[PDB]
Amino acid sequence: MTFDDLTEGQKNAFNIVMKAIKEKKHHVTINGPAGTGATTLTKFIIEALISTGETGIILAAPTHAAKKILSKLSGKEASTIHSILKINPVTYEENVLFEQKEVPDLAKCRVLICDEVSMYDRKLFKILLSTIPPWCTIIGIGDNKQIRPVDPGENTAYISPFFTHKDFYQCELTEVKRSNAPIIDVATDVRNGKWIYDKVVDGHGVRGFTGDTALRDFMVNYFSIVKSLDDLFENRVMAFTNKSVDKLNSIIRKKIFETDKDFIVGEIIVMQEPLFKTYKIDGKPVSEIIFNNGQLVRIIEAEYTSTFVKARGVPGEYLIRHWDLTVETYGDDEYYREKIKIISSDEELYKFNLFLGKTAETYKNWNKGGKAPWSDFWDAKSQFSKVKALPASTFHKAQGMSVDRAFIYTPCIHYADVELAQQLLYVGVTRGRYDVFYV
Amino acid sequence: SSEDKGEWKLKLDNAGNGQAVIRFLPSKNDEQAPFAILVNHGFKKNGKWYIETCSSTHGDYDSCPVCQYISKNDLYNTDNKEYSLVKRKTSYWANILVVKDPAAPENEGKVFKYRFGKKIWDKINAMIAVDVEMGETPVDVTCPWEGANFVLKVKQVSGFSNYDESKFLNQSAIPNIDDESFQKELFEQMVDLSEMTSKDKFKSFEELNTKFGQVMGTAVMGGAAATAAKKADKVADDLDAFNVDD
DNA sequence: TTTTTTTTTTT
Ligand SMILES: [Zn+2]
């Protein structure tokens, strides 16, 4: 097609991209921002690679949803990294971690493509290098302005070693500096570090809401834009805390449909973790993943019931009131009709956590003979997942989700580090493909 | 406690009250380093914390991000409540030879390091500087022949340690002052605070800058986003009001 | 100095 005919930054990277394969063995990460169009350049490197015939590349996306839309637009099938690397958990009492079964040779994989390289954590980082062979060449895409992973065990600078100079030399991507786009030029200032300011073209752009009643005014402006529209696919509100979101969905649910319900039949929700169909098997069951984390689903039937839980070694069964919602696949993935038990009460949730601790108190040092009933641990533990409604997600959980219009809520951010606040911004701004309002 | 870190502190009563009797130490090195003065900005916000030193201790107002942001906005009047929360705290440090401590009889007869507050420093300054006219010529408490021991007495008022009752005593010779070995025995108990004064202070300003950034966002003078920090306070309360509006 | 006085978020 167009082949070799682009800009200096686009041309420079690919030539260096070839160099890493062509000159010695080297691994590179690229700090493409948004708007810089490294996705468009990546389309050509897709085309150019087919003439050489190298199959050693693997299409890797860290998240399922990023892999889904990657496969959807490109048309080529891509797999999850959990399947690529066979990461299998290890049941312990204190902690638990998905762990790769063995170091593979990756002989057929002579080149490596990765996305969102900021997300992969450093403790995992050291393990992967030994798994990676020398002949394989690593290519990474990500933004230094993208959001870093959260490690409760360690609070530090913790820049992804993809972004640390010692691991390997890399190259950043230049950007179409000037353009008739107010938000991106404001987004350019966002990457620069200027505070957010409203800039509008033709009535569409960055717009601010100020004053004492700004929020209520912004709320009626929020209400004005949304109305009773049941299609929020392109309307994504983002906030950090789930506390705020919880009070929102409470209030918000009552708005669109005239019901005072915590959850009502017919609602659309998204997984917060993958759905595994677990079978009892020696060692660790890899199970079968049913619904991926980030998978959209449509609720079929909704009801609130209770379920008695009994643990061997604990006398009797213990009733817990929950939501028994049946849900079906919403989207282009494999169709499944299912039913889940879900607890949505703070009273019950603390009731839930307490049972675990008594079971934790008793199981860590059990000795009436035998081993320990942990098949009744996860069977009782895995019966319930945690998911949240569509309208709002955390800036963490809104990453990657490209929607037309974004409404942004800033106040709870001050408890976060400065750099993260700008990385949320970039990610937050990139969620709105068409328009953004800011209060 | 504090003794595990090597510094003595008082075993407070149920009222928090406590009495103890101690003698001081002179200068560990010759003609220098009698005492120390420590500056530390200390505050807690967003659950995040900050307890580290300041380079304006040696007059370097510049090599401290907690010092610079004040001068840009002059929080002393711009936001005095926020100013007081974070403002530099002055810590005075010295070695101490304990005499009597009923709260902890084990602490008696021994030497420590210690940090106190500024009112004592004014009283320490008030005690050391006396005119010639009042007959009583000025007195150094650390003097071997002229020095004095002192007794600390503290009560709590509205959650504050009060010392307004403190009073000094006459001069005092120190027993067994003519033995080098008894002096040496106590001399190793003396420690040099000047070591704490060398190049131990953080030279990397950008490192200190990073930590508070993880401690708290906003507060950028050239960014002016601190106004949005002022603005954020309203929204949380506004959020509470709109919750019932449901 | 009376004391590291708040967040969730990943498989
Ligand atoms: Zn300072």
Residue numbers in the entry:
A (entry chain C): 1 to 439
B (entry chain A): 24 to 269
Paper text:
A key protein in T4 DNA processing is the gp32 single-stranded DNA-binding protein. gp32 has two key functions: it binds cooperatively to single-stranded DNA (ssDNA) to protect it from nucleases and remove regions of secondary structure, and it recruits proteins to initiate DNA processes including replication and repair. Dda is a highly efficient monomeric helicase that is involved in multiple T4 DNA processing scenarios. Like all SF1B helicases, Dda translocates along one DNA strand in a 5′ to 3′ direction while displacing the other strand. gp32 comprises three domains: the central core region (residues 21–254) interacts with ssDNA, the N-terminal region (B domain, residues 1–20) mediates its cooperative assembly on ssDNA, and the C-terminal region (A domain, residues 255–301) recruits other T4 proteins. gp32 that lacks the N- and C-terminal regions is known as gp32-core, and gp32 that lacks the N-terminal or C-terminal regions is referred to as gp32-B and gp32-A, respectively.
We subsequently obtained higher quality crystals using non-His-tagged gp32 that diffracted to 4.98 Å resolution and identified a second Dda molecule in the structure resulting in two gp32–Dda–dT17 complexes in the asymmetric unit. In one of the complexes in the asymmetric unit, there are 11 visible nucleotides in the bound oligonucleotide that span the Dda and gp32 components; five nucleotides bound to gp32, five bound to Dda–K38A and one at the interface. In the second complex, there are nine visible nucleotides, but these are only bound to the Dda component. It appears that the slightly different relative orientation of gp32 and Dda compared to the first complex prevents the spanning of the oligonucleotide across the two proteins. The two electron densities are very similar and consistent with an α-helix that engages a surface cavity on the 2A RecA subdomain of Dda comprising helices 2Aα2, 2Aα3 and the loop connecting strand 2Aβ5 and helix 2Aα4. In this final structure of the gp32–Dda–dT17 complex, there was no obvious additional electron density corresponding to residues 271–301 at the very C-terminus of gp32, and they appear to be disordered. Despite the low resolution, the oligonucleotide binding site on the gp32 core domain is unequivocal and comprises Lys28, Lys32, Lys67, Lys71, Trp72, Lys112, Arg138 and Phe183 that engage the five bound nucleotides. In both cases, the electron density is consistent with an α-helix positioned adjacent to the body of the partner gp32 and interacting with the α-helix spanning residues 141–152. Second, there are two gp32 dimers in the crystal lattice within and between asymmetric units, both of which appear to be linked by the N-terminus, and these create a filament in the crystal with Dda molecules arrayed on the outside. In one of the complexes in the crystallographic dimer, the bound oligonucleotide spans the Dda and gp32 components and is consistent with Dda directly ‘feeding’ the ssDNA to the ssDNA-binding site of gp32.
